């Protein structure tokens, strides 16, 4: 799935991510935007570490999921990485506070630190009713 932005600025605003852990709202819909571009069924191999990034956050299964194939993985997200690529994100949402209850926070991604930190990201929520 593929979302609008204002549509997944009020999902995500529904499953309590606003302000959680200090996160804006606007924060999460930069990193998703950069991310995967709001789609749910984005993956990304790296044939380095042959680990894959699954869906619209793009989680790592080298530490957040199980997808069977990645040498020396672990689980921390307890979840299939086929639950990452579903419609329905609240897996998924459930999966990046987890990710962020850990030090480095959102920073993990360099996606939100080369286009969001230091940035303003309000443009992201407005005009969403959030």
Same mark, same amino acid.
């Given at each position: 799935?593929?979302?609008?932005?204002?549509?997944?600025?009020?999902?995500?605003?529904?499953?309590?991510?606003?302000?959680?852990?200090?996160?804006?709202?606007?924060?999460?819909?930069?990193?998703?935007?950069?991310?995967?571009?709001?789609?749910?069924?984005?993956?990304?191999?790296? %044939?380095?570490?042959?680990?894959?990034?699954?869906? !619209?956050?793009? !989680?790592?299964?080298?530490?957040?999921?199980?997808?069977?194939?990645?040498?020396? %993985?672990?689980? %921390?997200?307890?979840?299939?990485?086929?639950?990452?690529?579903?419609?329905? !994100?609240?897996?998924?949402?459930?999966?990046?506070?987890?990710?962020?209850?850990?030090?480095?926070? !959102?920073?993990?991604?360099?996606?939100?630190?080369?286009?969001?930190?230091?940035?303003?990201?309000?443009?992201?929520?407005?005009?969403?009713?959030?």
């Amino acid at each position: 799935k593929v979302f609008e932005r204002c549509e997944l600025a009020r999902t995500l605003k529904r499953l309590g991510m606003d302000g959680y852990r200090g996160i804006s709202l606007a924060n999460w819909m930069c990193l998703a935007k950069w991310e995967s571009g709001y789609n749910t069924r984005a993956t990304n191999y790296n %044939a380095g570490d042959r680990s894959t990034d699954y869906g !619209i956050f793009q !989680i790592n299964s080298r530490y957040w999921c199980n997808d069977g194939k990645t040498p020396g %993985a672990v689980n %921390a997200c307890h979840l299939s990485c086929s639950a990452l690529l579903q419609d329905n !994100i609240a897996d998924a949402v459930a999966c990046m506070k987890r990710v962020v209850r850990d030090p480095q926070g !959102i920073r993990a991604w360099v996606a939100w630190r080369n286009r969001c930190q230091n940035r303003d990201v309000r443009q992201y929520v407005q005009g969403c009713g959030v």
